[PDB]
Design a protein around this nucleic acid. Structure first.
Ligand SMILES: Nc1nc2c(ncn2[C@@H]2O[C@H](COP(=O)(O)OP(=O)(O)OP(=O)(O)O)[C@@H](O)[C@H]2O)c(=O)[nH]1
Ligand SMILES: [Mg+2]
Ligand SMILES: [Mg+2]
Lengths: 82, 75, 83, 885, 275
RNA sequence: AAGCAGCUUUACAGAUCAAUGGCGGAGGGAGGUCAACAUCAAGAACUGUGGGCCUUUGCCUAUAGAACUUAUAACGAACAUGGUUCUUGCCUUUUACCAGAACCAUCCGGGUGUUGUCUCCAUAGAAACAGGUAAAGCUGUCCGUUACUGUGGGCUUGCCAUAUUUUUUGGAACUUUUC
């Protein structure tokens, strides 16, 4: 999602240059810019066990503005007449 | 618009001729854009130096319109 | 205007100024302003009746001056050209 | 073969002015000003002179069709043939121009563009001494690098005004493609970075101290020039001075009124962006992309600018240059910045008091000039001179004192006669004009001219005076030797290929010592010739002129070497003795404090707005004992008995006969110090200078009977022998110079640079600056000068052109060579670099064989040992205790 | 409007036509925009490597310019007990500084020093990226009723609303482009004179190429150096060309025919000449 | 730059409808795989014109004009060959060769400047007259609008504040001696 992501950087880039920021937070923010030229080669390592056709592509399209049914109840004990 | 440049002179005893005949010599404190000049320990010079000379006041201000020329006696 | 600009050209140049009071101050020019009030150095002063004296430094209000004489060389000064 | 230069008088290019009105302005000292153009490497300095020359002149015969268009620069002030080939300024050059400011007041301005490469930092020290104000040209991409910082620090030191030129604004849009707000943050970052280094003065585009420029596209402007051209017509005339102050600096404009806070509901930029950068980037955008018929209407509507019918059929780079030269019409905003910055009432008395001794102003009857350097200007030997008083005509006779003599002549001027100074005739006077010399019959006060007939009387600088009466000679001031910033520390030993060509070499080396002022040419006792240089490029420029220009001979040349210094690590029956028993002088040694060494390298002793310079450091002995006791915590007795500060060293009288008879010592004191100068110049290890050794004169013996004739002549070789016994006993070491490195590389190519610093020996990266707005970053580190052979090209080949370093020796970092200097069992492998523990033994043994002090068959090691100076029976006593190996 | 006429000299194009030819030509263009790529690989360094008898690792090899080299003087000057050995003097050191790292250099030429480190941001992934854009790998920039002008006072070019035009991203690619794509006009050259493959061996090949084709890069560089080193200038008094002086004779006539027809005639005529 | 004034033109109604004055006009425009003749590598370099010195040359001084080519130096963003001489390479002799140099040439090409020619498109003339060069309104005579207004366009312009101390909304007025 390069196009919208680039827009996230551009607002993010507006943070550092044209606005005043707390110091310790600020050095971490520009480190992200540094990694960005460095291309992310230290955020890209992990356990890709599953092939891209062996993971059945259930890319769940859920938005953090959706009341999500908070189903704590199935972790309770119950009584299966099933 | 532009302020006259008296900047070096200030704090120096200066003689200046005002309007038709009068000559006034005094320490100079302030100047403005119209050349209005305020100087302290003013004295009105005349033909007889000690005699006809009379002091004016502790502080005197001069309209810039009556100034003909300014000469600073000093460094 | 060019006439005042020319006065800047005069600066550092022995110039002669005639007051409307009738006197004549010939000497070097320390400073000038758009107002035209001119302050000189080492001026040789000629009173209206001819008595000549010598003054270390001078300032004259612009309104007083009748005319100014400036270095003849200035005439071919770069600014003057019409085009 | 050497330069390109118009020799014919009739082919000298005419000017827009008539050039006699320019020389009429030389009569007024206040009218004329001297600006010298300094900056980093490739900063656009010579191109900034291209804009000032071709707008002064009407037709230059050296300018071609590619140069009249945008394609190739007229490096008009790079007239040397090597400068055309290197693409680089090497020599100082200049051109005297008549220039008008925004108030149309014409005045004679003497320009001098210094070379920006860091090995030619001797040439800009001439430009700092010549100029009234420096026009420091900064590229916007690299910004304020570490070579910019020193050019701000040197101009404060030389009591010289400064005015900053931000250059290369095309790279800010065409190379880097920054959005216009993102480039305003770039310009605001650099200006805030030059204001920290200018410790007093704030620099800002409102204050007319900062000029914006993109010199390849041939324009320059202040914000005062830009308002006075295109916005002064619209707004009332009482508002033009208040509008240009509301223009830079986070203040916003919308519909007639100004606010510091951003306007609500409106996408709005700062006033500098909206009124200058947005109009400028539209000129960049539309000259490249907008149709030439629609663009022609926008230039009449907004800029009142008519595009020619010939100009519409232009290639995109000459068309972009033609529009930016038809806007931004002249360099009247550059000259107005040069006019408004310089204040001769504040600076010219302090500038004279820095080049010579501080005193009262010399009278106008005295002719008094400063001879800056000897210039090989256009197939002749000229002298670059600046006049400070009087009037000089062609054919006069002047007294010309070499500046190396002016330390004693100024000291002998006090007197609590005749034959004092050689006399040469002023053969010819000219004005430097780039590719020509314009002859003039006389030269007034305050202007830089070129005089033929002076250069034989001096080496490397001079003072020129012509005094009328003998009483008037008492008050004249002599100039101090010129503070070339980098020390000549890069060493090359040469001899001619043929022995019969040696007088032609010695004739050419005397020319190079004049022409290249930052060299130290010396002759060793073996007959070889040592040239001390600033770098690899400074030697390659030197040895071109030595082989091609000044001597047609072929010469043998060694590898790059360095100068070593000698020191000690600790303090240390210590005595010295001559074969005659009449003289017995005991000297101890001790390392000086690191802060005491570091401040004497800065040429002044003190801390915290209280410092005493080395020239008058003897003249206040009460105040010197105050500085030594308070700041560094010495003893009260050691503060009172210090005799002399020679370069990096100190002598203290600590003896009981000084408590008995100091007057007997005082008649022999001046020649102990003369012998102390005779020992610091060539030390005991490898005939190398001594640096950072605290000498203490422990005792001195005076024979029965007194002879001024014999005692005077004997104590000077013995004190030099006695200083060797003190240093060799005190655990001696060897020092090496340390270049500081200023690397510019792209940000991905940094691990290449870090591995490249590990292949060298004593290299360390101390600071890594993200150069903001750019893909590249600044790397600051150090390297030893003996290791920095081909360092500059190892960096460039490994980064594929995206790397560059500047190697410089501003700070005088002398570092202990890692070995032990007295190692009889050190393993020196042939043809390979010796290991790190063998370094102090290797560098001394090879130096002692270049000098001829240690003579071996192939490799015989007689080390610097404490037995040829002391008695041999005492040397056997030193072996049994374990003190001496 | 694009050419002077059917004499076919001195063309001149507009910006969209010029960028369109630039885009078709990307298999055969130069594809290098900085002159710092050619640091020790320009022809000044190629002349020095011939004159100093050094070998640049991709450059050509020549005969010795001064083959009488084996003479020597027995002297204490360059002996091993004299020389400090710190850094091996490479052949790249001898060519970058010909007067410093060479005892007795002659017929060497002064090389160009650096150019400023080129930081040109190009954008090739997306056409919808604007022409002026804060690209990644750029370092960020971290920092930080009184007076009234009459209304409708505007900055310069305020009536023109857009900064980036639809041809600006194309034109800035052409501005930093090598010859002839940075031009929009120029004279005609011959079909002989358009060296499409010259820019391939003026560059470093890559490490991936085999050894039989890296020799072909070196051997074509060697012919490039010898043409630059030895110019044969044309004399001006040659006013009699062959086709022009035969046109003046009554024994030659002129027409236009096909090329393949004129080739078949010259084969028939040239067979009739030799037979 | 809207607007007013000044200026320059303009469709013009004019004044004059004379002597005038200004600009334009007194044998085109675009071209051609057309031609001829000059010219194209040198103190960073050219030529015309006036003045002075020496006795034409040369120098000095003043002025006008400089197309093309050239600075990481060359008409060509390109690139072959030949001759001689020196030094090598191959190794029966020669030719043809090997591959570096130095000095010279030939060949394929290019620019610019005039003039002639050729092709296509042309028509207001007042393009009327008289002189002459290597060139032409080159000059004289001349004709078109016309030199002084108002409307309509453009700007080499006003400084957008026009009465309250440095300029243009008045410190002015009156009387007296000498000669
Ligand atoms: N993009 C861009 N390049 C420039 C500009 N000015 C100069 N350059 C280039 O940068 C190089 C350096 O310019 P120079 O004229 O040699 O400036 P310099 O500072 O005198 O260089 P030095 O000789 O080392 O002192 C030149 O080759 C120019 O082509 C500029 O304004 N913009
Ligand atoms: Mg330069
Ligand atoms: Mg035979």
């Amino acid at each position: 999602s390069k196009k919208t992501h680039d827009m996230i950087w551009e607002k993010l880039r507006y943070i550092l240059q044209t606005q005043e920021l707390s110091s310790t937070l600020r050095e971490s923010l520009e480190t992200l810019f540094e990694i960005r030229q460095k291309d992310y080669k230290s955020g890209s390592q992990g356990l890709f066990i599953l092939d891209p056709t062996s993971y059945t592509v259930h890319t769940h399209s859920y938005i953090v503005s959706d009341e999500d049914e908070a189903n704590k109840e199935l972790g309770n004990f119950e009584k299966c007449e099933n | 618009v532009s302020t006259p440049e008296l900047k070096k002179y200030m704090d120096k005893k200066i003689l200046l001729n005002i309007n038709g005949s009068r000559k006034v010599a005094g320490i100079l404190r302030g100047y403005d854009i119209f050349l209005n000049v305020v100087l302290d320990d003013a004295m009105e010079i005349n033909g007889e130096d000690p005699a006809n000379n009379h002091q004016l006041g502790l502080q005197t201000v001069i309209r810039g319109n009556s100034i003909i020329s300014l000469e600073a006696l000093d460094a | 205007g060019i006439p005042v600009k020319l006065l800047n050209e005069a600066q550092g140049h022995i110039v002669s100024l005639e007051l409307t009071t009738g006197a004549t101050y010939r000497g070097k020019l320390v400073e000038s302003e758009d107002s035209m009030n001119v302050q000189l150095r080492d001026v040789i002063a000629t009173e209206p009746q001819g008595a000549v004296t010598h003054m270390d430094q001078i300032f004259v209000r612009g309104s007083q001056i009748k005319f100014i004489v400036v270095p003849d060389l200035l005439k071919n000064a770069p600014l003057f050209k019409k085009n | 073969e050497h330069t390109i230069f118009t020799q014919l008088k009739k082919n000298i290019p005419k000017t827009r002015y008539n050039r006699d009105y320019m020389l009429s302005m030389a009569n007024i000292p206040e009218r004329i000003i001297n600006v010298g153009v300094i900056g980093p490497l490739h900063s656009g300095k010579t191109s900034l002179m291209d804009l000032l020359v071709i707008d002064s002149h009407k037709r230059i015969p050296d300018m071609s069709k590619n140069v009249e268009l945008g394609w190739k620069p007229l490096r008009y002030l790079d007239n040397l043939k090597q400068e055309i080939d290197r693409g680089l300024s090497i020599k100082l050059n200049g051109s005297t121009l008549l220039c008008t400011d925004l108030e149309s007041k014409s005045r004679m301005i003497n320009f001098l563009d210094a070379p920006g490469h860091v090995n030619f930092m001797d040439e800009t020290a001439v430009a700092l001494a010549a100029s009234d104000l420096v026009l420091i040209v900064i590229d916007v991409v690299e910004g304020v690098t570490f070579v910019v910082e020193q050019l701000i620090k040197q101009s404060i030191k030389n009591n010289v005004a400064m005015c900053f030129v931000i250059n290369k604004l095309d790279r800010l849009i065409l190379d880097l493609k920054l959005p216009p707000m993102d480039a305003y943050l770039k310009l605001n970052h650099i200006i805030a970075n030059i204001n920290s280094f200018t410790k007093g003065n704030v620099f800002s585009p409102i204050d007319n101290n900062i000029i914006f420029a993109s010199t390849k596209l041939g324009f320059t402007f202040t914000i005062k020039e830009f308002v006075s051209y295109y916005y002064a017509h619209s707004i009332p005339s009482s508002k033009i001075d208040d509008f240009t102050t509301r223009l830079w600096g986070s203040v916003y404009y919308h519909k007639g009124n100004f606010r510091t806070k951003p306007f609500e509901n409106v996408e709005k930029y700062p006033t500098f962006v909206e009124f200058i950068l947005i109009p400028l980037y539209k000129i960049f955008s539309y000259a490249l992309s907008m149709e030439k018929d629609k663009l022609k209407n926008l230039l009449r509507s907004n800029f009142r600018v008519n595009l020619s019918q010939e100009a519409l059929q232009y290639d995109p780079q000459p068309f972009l240059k033609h529009v930016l030269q038809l806007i931004f019409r002249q360099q009247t905003g550059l000259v107005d910045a040069i006019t408004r910055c310089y204040q001769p009432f504040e600076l010219f008395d302090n500038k004279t008091a820095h080049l010579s001794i501080p005193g009262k102003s010399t009278p106008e009857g005295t002719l008094w000039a400063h001879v800056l350097k000897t210039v090989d200007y256009g197939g002749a030997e000229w002298s670059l001179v600046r006049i400070y008083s009087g009037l000089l005509k062609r054919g006069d006779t002047v007294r010309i004192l070499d500046t190396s003599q002016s330390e004693s002549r100024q000291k002998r001027q006090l007197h609590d006669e005749d034959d004092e100074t050689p006399s040469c005739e002023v053969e010819e006077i000219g004005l430097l004009g780039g590719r020509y010399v314009y002859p003039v019959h006389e030269a007034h006060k305050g202007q830089i001219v070129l005089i033929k007939g002076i250069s034989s009387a001096y080496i490397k600088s001079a003072t020129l005076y012509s005094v009328k009466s003998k009483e008037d000679m008492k008050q004249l001031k002599f100039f101090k030797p010129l503070d070339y910033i980098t020390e000549a520390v890069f060493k090359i030993v040469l001899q001619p290929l043929l022995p019969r060509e040696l007088p032609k070499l010695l004739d050419a080396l005397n020319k190079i010592s004049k022409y290249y002022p930052g060299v130290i040419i010396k002759v060793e006792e073996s007959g070889e010739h040592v040239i001390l240089g600033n770098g690899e490029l400074y030697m390659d420029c030197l040895l071109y002129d030595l082989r091609a220009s000044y001597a047609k001979i072929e010469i043998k040349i060694s590898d790059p070497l360095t100068v070593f210094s000698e020191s000690c690590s600790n303090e240390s029956s210590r005595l010295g003795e001559e074969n005659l028993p009449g003289l017995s002088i005991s000297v101890a040694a001790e390392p000086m404090d690191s802060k005491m060494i570091q401040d004497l390298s800065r040429n002044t002793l003190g801390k915290g707005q209280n410092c005493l310079d080395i020239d008058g450091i003897m003249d206040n002995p009460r105040k010197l004992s105050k500085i030594l006791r308070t700041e560094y915590g010495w003893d009260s007795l050691a503060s009172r008995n210090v005799w002399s500060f020679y370069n990096g060293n100190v002598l203290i009288n600590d003896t009981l006969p000084d408590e008995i008879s100091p007057e007997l010592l005082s008649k022999y004191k001046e020649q102990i110090i003369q012998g102390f100068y005779w020992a610091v110049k060539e030390g005991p290890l490898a005939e190398e200078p001594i640096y950072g050794v605290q000498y203490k004169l422990l005792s001195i013996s005076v024979p029965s009977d007194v002879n001024i004739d014999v005692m005077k002549s004997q104590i000077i070789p013995l004190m030099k022998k006695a200083c060797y016994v003190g240093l060799l006993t005190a655990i001696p070491i060897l020092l090496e110079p340390i270049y500081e490195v200023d690397i510019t590389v792209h940000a991905p190519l940094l691990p290449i640079v870090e591995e490249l610093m590990k292949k060298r020996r004593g290299s360390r990266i101390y600071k890594t600056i993200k150069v903001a707005g750019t893909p590249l970053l600044e790397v600051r580190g150090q390297v030893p000068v003996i290791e920095s052979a081909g360092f500059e090209t190892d960096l460039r080949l490994s980064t594929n052109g995206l790397g560059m370093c500047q190697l410089y020796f501003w700070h005088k970092i002398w570092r202990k060579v890692p070995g032990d200097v007295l190692d009889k069992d050190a393993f020196i492998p042939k043809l390979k670099p010796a290991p790190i523990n063998s370094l102090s033994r290797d560098f001394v043994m090879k130096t002692r064989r270049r000098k001829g002090i240690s003579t071996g068959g192939f490799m015989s090691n007689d080390g610097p040992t404490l037995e040829k100076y002391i008695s041999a029976e005492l040397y056997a006593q030193l072996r049994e205790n374990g003190l001496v190996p | 409007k694009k050419v002077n006429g059917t004499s076919y000299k001195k063309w001149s194009f507009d910006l969209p036509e010029m960028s369109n030819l630039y885009r078709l030509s990307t298999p055969l263009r130069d594809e290098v925009t900085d002159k710092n790529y050619y640091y020790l690989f320009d022809k000044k360094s190629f002349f020095n490597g011939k004159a100093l008898n050094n070998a640049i690792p991709g450059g050509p090899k020549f005969e010795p310019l001064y083959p009488r080299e084996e003479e020597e003087d027995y002297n204490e000057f360059n002996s091993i007990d004299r020389v400090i050995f710190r850094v091996p003097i490479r052949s790249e050191y001898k060519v970058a500084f010909p007067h410093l790292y060479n005892s007795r250099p002659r017929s060497v030429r002064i090389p160009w020093y650096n150019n400023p480190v080129s930081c040109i941001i190009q954008n090739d992934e997306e056409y919808d990226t604007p022409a002026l854009f804060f690209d990644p790998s750029l370092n960020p920039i971290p920092h930080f009723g009184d007076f009234t002008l009459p209304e409708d006072f505007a900055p310069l070019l305020a009536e023109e609303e857009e900064l980036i035009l639809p041809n600006t991203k194309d034109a800035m690619s052409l501005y930093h482009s090598p010859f002839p794509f940075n031009r929009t006009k120029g004279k005609m050259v011959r079909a002989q004179d358009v060296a499409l493959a010259k820019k391939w061996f003026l560059q470093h090949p890559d490490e991936e190429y085999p050894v039989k084709v890296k020799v072909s890069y070196q051997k074509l560089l060697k012919n490039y150096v010898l043409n630059e080193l030895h110019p044969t200038l044309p004399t001006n008094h040659n006013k009699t060309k062959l086709l022009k002086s035969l046109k003046n004779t009554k024994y030659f006539q002129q027409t236009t025919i096909d090329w393949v027809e004129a080739g078949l005639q010259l084969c028939r005529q040239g067979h009739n000449m030799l037979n």
